[PDB]
């Protein structure tokens, strides 16, 4: 019944955003609530943020 077939692949790139599910290897799940800037972070005495 079919004359010819055209197959089209697509590729897309997914960044991260509030809503995704990340989880460690010990069973501690989580949904990313906020996405803060760098300077609102707890930094230690050496200056590097967390």
């Amino acid at each position: 019944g079919v004359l010819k077939i055209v197959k089209v692949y697509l590729a897309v790139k997914r960044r991260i955003q509030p809503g995704d599910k990340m989880a460690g290897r010990h069973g501690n799940k989580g949904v990313i609530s906020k996405i803060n800037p760098i300077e609102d972070m707890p930094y230690d005495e050496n200056g590097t943020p967390v």
Partner: protein
């Protein structure tokens, strides 16, 4: 000398025979049977949905 439409019947038979030959060839090479291995491709056709208002 009565009336005559023999040429009409010959013309109509010619149209029918030519159309039957063309449609027999198209239905011969479009619904063929694949041999010993099967259908070498797949259809894969899918239809999604839309947002259709109802005014």
């Amino acid at each position: 000398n009565p009336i005559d439409l023999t040429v009409l019947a010959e013309y109509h038979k010619q149209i029918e025979s030519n159309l039957q030959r063309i449609e027999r060839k198209n239905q011969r090479t479009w619904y063929s049977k694949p041999g010993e291995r099967g259908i070498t491709c797949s259809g894969r056709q899918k239809i999604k949905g839309k947002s259709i208002p109802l005014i």
